[PDB]
């Protein structure tokens, strides 16, 4: 067979140990999910806006008493209500409080006032993967594999908790000081033991079955991994066009083209992740995540060493000290005004 006795016994034991880890991880998650205003706004100096969404913004802050820097996500409650994202916001906070994994951002404080909701999480200083990818152009296959292996482990973890992530893309991946990935946004994540039906995600990363308005499962995350690996290694995604509707036609077509510089191992992995047919997509078969982790393209990956953050990163971002923001673009700075009247109090009672 492909493995001799020694390799086969090593692999089997490794897979069993993953099961034991994930079982303990699930037990810890549920305890924290069952039993979760831990700061206030004048506890922080606001320094600079790090990113923006329709919700509000993410700002670098310094915790006054301790001097530590954090990223503070500020959500305008009235905007959240108008955007119909009440449940997303409460769910994101609930996930972030409960999960624990080396590539998932750590929430430190959360609180609210009359106008806004605040999520204070670890500051990830190395910038968006998106910027690094567009600047470098494309990542070498070893560089892409280092990142990909972190997403595989992160999805292995989230899926064992029955969480589908649903918004993988370089824009949602930050690089920390050691060159490792941090995931921070869980606004579309959902606990899905079986199937779910919501049309959500980003057009280039949508699995066909989402586009086709089907009931779908965690395999959409493995499709999105294929898109991500492709984009990291090519510098552009497998399916693009002027308008989303044309991107969708390409996604559902079953056809994908690869740059000539893609290795054969990479193309094979990608054809199995970017598989329209759910009965054949890697990550969705009887062998589970093992089809991905044991694929030839990952043969050089020491999965435990990645988890332990003992692999030397291929790229270490510029770090000029704490509170340095040079890896982030400049955003227009608004003002965090706090109304004298409580807004949307009932809707966000549990926050």
């Amino acid at each position: 067979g492909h493995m001799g006795n020694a390799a086969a016994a090593k692999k089997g034991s490794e897979q069993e140990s993953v099961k034991e880890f994930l079982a303990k991880a699930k037990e810890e998650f549920l305890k924290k999910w069952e039993s979760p205003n831990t700061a206030q706004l004048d506890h922080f100096d606001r320094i600079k806006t790090l990113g923006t969404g329709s919700f509000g913004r993410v700002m670098l802050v310094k915790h006054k008493e301790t001097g530590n820097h954090y990223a503070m996500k500020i959500l305008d409650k009235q905007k959240v209500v108008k955007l119909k994202q009440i449940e997303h916001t409460l769910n994101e906070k609930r996930i972030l409080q409960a999960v624990n994994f080396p590539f998932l951002v750590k929430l430190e404080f959360s609180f609210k006032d009359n106008s806004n909701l605040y999520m204070v999480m670890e500051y990830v200083p190395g910038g968006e993967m998106f910027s690094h990818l567009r600047r470098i152009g494309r990542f070498s296959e070893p560089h892409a594999r280092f990142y990909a292996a972190q997403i595989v482990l992160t999805f292995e973890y989230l899926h064992s908790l029955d969480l589908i992530y649903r918004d993988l893309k370089p824009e949602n991946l930050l690089i920390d000081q050691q060159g490792y990935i941090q995931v921070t946004d869980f606004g579309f994540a959902k606990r899905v033991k079986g199937r779910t039906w919501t049309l959500c995600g980003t057009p280039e990363y949508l699995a066909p079955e989402i586009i086709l308005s089907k009931g779908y499962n965690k395999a959409v995350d493995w499709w999105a991994l294929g898109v991500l690996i492709y984009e990291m290694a090519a510098g552009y995604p497998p399916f693009f066009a002027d308008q989303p509707i044309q991107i969708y036609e390409k996604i559902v077509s079953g056809k994908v083209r690869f740059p000539s510089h893609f290795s054969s191992d990479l193309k094979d992995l990608l054809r199995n992740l970017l598989q329209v047919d759910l009965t054949k997509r890697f990550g969705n078969l009887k062998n589970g995540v093992n089809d991905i982790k044991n694929h030839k393209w990952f043969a050089t990956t020491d999965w435990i060493a990645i988890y332990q953050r003992k692999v030397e990163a291929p790229f270490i971002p510029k770090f000029k000290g704490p509170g340095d923001t040079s890896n982030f673009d400049d955003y227009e700075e608004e003002e965090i005004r706090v109304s004298i009247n409580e807004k949307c109090g009932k809707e966000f009672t549990e926050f």
């Binding site: 968006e128 959500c200 995600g201 280039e204 510098g235 552009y236 002027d242 083209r257």
Partner: peptide
């Protein structure tokens, strides 16, 4: 080239989720 086609799509910047 395919890269040129990607540029021509205008979706080379940060992409929003659908809404």
């Amino acid at each position: 080239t395919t890269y040129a086609d990607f540029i021509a799509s205008g979706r080379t910047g940060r992409r929003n989720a659908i809404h």
